[PDB]
Ligand binder design. Structure first.
Ligand SMILES: Nc1ncnc2c1ncn2[C@@H]1O[C@H](COP(=O)(O)OP(=O)(O)O)[C@@H](O)[C@H]1O
Ligand SMILES: Cc1ccc2c(c1)N=C1N(c3ccccc3)CC[C@@]1(O)C2=O
Ligand code: VO4
Ligand SMILES: [Mg+2]
Ligand SMILES: [Mg+2]
Length: 703
């Protein structure tokens, strides 16, 4: 049994290493210690100080360099060192910030990235490979109760699986994290694990669904070299017996803006670099390809390469995964034609003509896009610069200037990309979801909280989703928990855990008084609205009125929102246009007549191409996002949730480099210590009368 053999790969990579005789001596010491701040302005940088004397209400300790006193009430006592490395931190004697951090630190220094913290798992990103995800590792966790094995993503997954089986109840794994923290890597482990322990070709297809979604849906940001730019809820579907019967992927709004624009040092989606890198000699000639530096959509950020990544080799892994799921050879080529055409569309250069209206002098990029899409270039050209609209009921051909033409070209590119992405997901689900499910384990992998120099509408919706996901943790752990104690009069004084995202949530998504998204919608159907009347309207409603809103003094085009994870300043530029998400009907008409059968489905299949109305207007992006999110949340409420808090070590994507302030800000805003205290102070279990423990109106409550 590897669990008991100190020689195993399991003992090597998952367990605290045996201390020595020197450590033994330190462990049996009578001395007592305190975590303190050498600099009191820097509350997150701590040293250990020996307690030298005490009074009834103070400790005096030595500082690493002097002697200092501290009220016993303000003291952060160091745990007896036998606790250093402990697997579940609810066992700690002293529950305080530097103690909890120190325990994570001890484990991380040995590459022990998983630690329990009461009921939920904490995962600190290694930023390097650790050999803990093998079949042998999987075989080990299969069937093991949480206290029989070391903290692992596998173990939380097994527990959800047995809860599903024994309780006849759908489960979810809610994996939290700021951008780069590990959500997506852990999601893949949950999937690997569920597929192995409950498996019977379907399994390999479930696994191969990921590299396709990542190629088209992930990109290098300044925070994450593999940033998920769409969120997903993955259902792992089980028959009544308890074997995997399939899976189903719900994807949430993709960041389509990245196709046409990237910040300095970022990349477009991986797939663009992979085609250019790994295409055959005849792919490149048939598609009219060249190098990234040749394409406006690839040559603006100054980064075409990611360190440690071969795009050509990733291209091969994307084609392999596409073969295995079932994309036919003509389908794959069609996919790449669309990729290529988008790049050609990016190279169209509009110029001013005699009048205000744009012209196309050089038609090379236009002709190459039209060739690979299989559309008529003279029709596409007309649709870009001279699209037809109704003025009343009259049919009036516009003549768009350079800016408007360029922006219409962008809209068509983003619609092609977003519709292709939804098509990929549709196709994948048709393969993976071939039987009705009896049960599911859902795994949630969203875009994590993020802040850049410039935050826009996309960041607001991401950060709001992360805020709602934190509220859902607060709700389970603290609010629902205590309401049970109340409806069961169990002698429980209510505790205010002071973690409440409601005010920020209401500010963003309130309907009465209207929140930010509601005001955005109003402005969006208002014919005279500009990004300036929008910001004005926002400041008018919230400035000096909402405690989570700030009108900045240094800018007339930004507003700040105080999120659980910190303040973000949002730039209002283009919000009305992003929210309306327009595309000229004449572009849709042009692409409806495509000779390509994939292109044709993107424009004629109403489940991909159709857009809902709200009275006389198409549904806004904010209204769609709101719908997806409420639908997500209602699904979760039907499940028993399991929480994994992923935690980023630093903001440099480096191994072996825990940054104090980075990690502790996460522990605070995640409510990790509060989560440990409800575990300790409260009453985990209760059974209807069944036929340091307590008797309720209808239930015995224990510990
Ligand atoms: N358990 C892990 N083992 C090895 N590397 C990891 C692990 N978790 C995260 N990483 C690394 O950190 C990067 C960011 O992780 P990822 O899961 O993509 O972030 P996010 O939270 O943004 O989904 C990964 O591409 C990988 O380099
Ligand atoms: C409900 C719900 C859940 C999860 C998400 C979501 C929405 N939206 C997201 N993003 C978005 C992009 C452009 C505009 C608006 C939103 C991009 C990431 C995103 O897919 C996400 O993690
Ligand atoms: O960088 V992550 O968007 O996948 O949170
Ligand atoms: Mg991710
Ligand atoms: Mg600024």
């Amino acid at each position: 049994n590897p669990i008991h053999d100190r020689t195993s790969d399991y003992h090597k990579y998952l367990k605290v290493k045996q201390g020595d005789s020197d450590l033994f001596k330190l462990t049996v010491s009578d001395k007592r210690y305190i975590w303190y701040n050498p600099d009191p302005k820097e509350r997150d940088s701590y040293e250990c100080g020996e307690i030298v004397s005490e009074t009834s209400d103070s400790f005096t300790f030595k500082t690493v360099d002097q002697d200092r006193q501290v009220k016993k009430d303000d003291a952060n006592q160091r745990n007896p060192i036998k606790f250093d490395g402990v697997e579940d931190m609810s066992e700690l004697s002293y529950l305080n910030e530097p103690a909890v951090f120190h325990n994570l630190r001890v484990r991380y220094n040995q590459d022990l990235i998983y630690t329990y913290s009461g009921l939920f798992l904490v995962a600190v990103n290694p930023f390097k490979r650790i050999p803990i995800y093998t079949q042998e590792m999987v075989d080990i966790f299969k069937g093991r109760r949480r206290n029989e094995v070391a903290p692992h993503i596998f173990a939380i997954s097994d527990v959800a699986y047995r809860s599903m089986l024994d309780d006849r109840q759908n489960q979810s794994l809610l994996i939290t994290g700021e951008s780069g923290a590990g959500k997506t890597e852990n999601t893949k482990k949950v999937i690997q694990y569920l597929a192995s322990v409950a498996g019977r070709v379907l399994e390999q297809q479930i696994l191969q669904a990921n590299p396709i979604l990542e190629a088209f849906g992930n990109a290098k940001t300044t925070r994450n070299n593999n940033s998920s730019r769409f969120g997903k809820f993955i259902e792992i579907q089980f028959n009544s017996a308890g074997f995997i019967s399939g899976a189903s992927i719900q994807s949430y709004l993709l960041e389509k803006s990245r196709v046409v624009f990237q910040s300095e040092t970022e990349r477009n989606y991986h797939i663009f670099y992979q085609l250019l890198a790994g295409a055959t000699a005849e792919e490149k000639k048939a598609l009219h390809l060249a190098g990234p530096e040749s394409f406006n959509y690839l040559n603006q950020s100054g980064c075409v390469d990611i360190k440690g990544v071969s795009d050509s080799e990733e291209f091969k892994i994307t084609r392999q995964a596409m073969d295995i799921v079932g994309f036919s050879q003509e389908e794959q080529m069609s996919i790449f034609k669309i990729i290529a055409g988008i790049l050609h569309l990016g190279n169209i250069k509009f110029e001013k003509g005699a009048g205000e209206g744009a012209v196309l002098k050089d038609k090379t990029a236009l002709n190459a896009a039209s060739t690979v899409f299989g559309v008529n270039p003279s029709v596409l050209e007309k649709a870009l610069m001279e699209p037809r609209i109704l003025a009343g009921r009259d049919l009036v051909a516009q003549h768009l200037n350079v800016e408007k033409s360029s922006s219409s070209r962008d809209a068509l590119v983003k619609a092609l990309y977003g519709r292709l992405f939804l098509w990929l997901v549709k196709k994948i689900n048709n393969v993976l979801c071939q039987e009705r499910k009896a049960y599911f384990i859902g795994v949630l992998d969203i875009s994590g909280f993020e802040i850049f120099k410039v935050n826009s509408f996309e960041q607001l919706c991401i950060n709001y989703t992360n805020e709602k996901l934190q509220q859902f943790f607060n709700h389970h752990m603290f609010k629902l928990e205590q309401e049970e104690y109340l409806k069961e009069k169990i002698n429980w004084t209510f505790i205010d855990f002071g973690l409440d995202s409601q005010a920020t949530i209401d500010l963003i998504d309130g309907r009465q008084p209207p929140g930010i998204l509601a005001l955005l919608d109003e402005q969006s159907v208002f014919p005279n609205a500009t990004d300036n009347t929008l910001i004005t309207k926002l400041h008018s409603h919230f400035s000096k009125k909402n405690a989570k809103y700030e009108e900045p003094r240094f800018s007339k085009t930004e507003f700040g929102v105080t999120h659980y994870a910190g303040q973000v300043m949002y730039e209002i530029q283009d919000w009305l246009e992003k929210n309306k998400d327009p595309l000229q009907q004449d572009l849709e008409l042009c692409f409806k007549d495509s000779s390509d059968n994939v292109v044709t489905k993107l424009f004629n299949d109403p489940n991909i191409a159709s857009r809902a109305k709200k009275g006389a207007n198409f549904i806004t992006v904010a209204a769609q996002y709101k719908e997806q999110l409420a639908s997500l949340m209602a699904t979760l409420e039907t499940t028993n949730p399991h929480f994994v808090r992923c935690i980023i070590p630093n903001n440099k994507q480096l191994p072996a480099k825990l940054e104090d302030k980075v990690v502790l800000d996460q522990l605070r805003c995640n409510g990790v210590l509060e989560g440990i205290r409800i575990t300790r102070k409260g009453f985990p279990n209760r059974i209807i009368y069944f036929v340091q423990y307590r008797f309720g109106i209808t239930k015995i409550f224990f510990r």
